[PDB]
Amino acid sequence: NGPESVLVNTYQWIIRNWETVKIQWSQDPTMLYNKMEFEPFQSLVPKAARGQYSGFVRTLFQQMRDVLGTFDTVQIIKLLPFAAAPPKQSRMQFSSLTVNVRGSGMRILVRGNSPVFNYNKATKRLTVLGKDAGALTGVESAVLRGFLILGKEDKRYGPALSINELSNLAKGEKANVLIGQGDVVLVMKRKRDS
């Protein structure tokens, strides 16, 4: 059972079982993250990264539960397998998350689409490494750790910052961030936390 099909089968599995997954993501997340069905995927994620990725993704998911009206189905399904590792707490922001496929790092972009995770809004279908993975059913809460994405660049808040330059922004302060793929968005550092 090679890596390509491990990635494809993992997302097909989340999709086929989304009814119970979604439920458990709200009502018993720990049990969901510990499901054995995520181990194959986990074996592909670089060992040095598994923990930090999981701490990042679980925090983002908690942001999304806490911040009401920001539930994003596609984002949850994308990031979920990275939550399966035991988390190591850290402060780093990630723009992509790696799965190793035969010595080559495939980069899953935290925001929007990539060869490994490509969602088509017209057909309502997910594609993983060119394989069809099945059908799927104003602030972004699961993109940055301890921030919300507000919307488009607002030039009033000054020149954009990269994702590793955000630590000095004051809590509650707003700023423009180079968020990946050349996109600049307005964000806000949260006062509330998890």
Residue numbers in the entry: 540 to 676, 685 to 741
Lines quoted from the article behind this entry:
Here, we report that a basic amino acid at position 591 of PB2 can compensate for the lack of PB2-627K and allows efficient replication of highly pathogenic H5N1 and pandemic H1N1 viruses in mammalian species. Our data indicated that a basic amino acid at PB2-591 can compensate for PB2-627K in mammalian adaptation; interestingly, these two residues are positioned near each other on the surface of PB2.
For comparison, we also present the crystal structure of the C-terminal portion of an H5N1 PB2 protein encoding PB2-627K (A/Vietnam/1203/04).
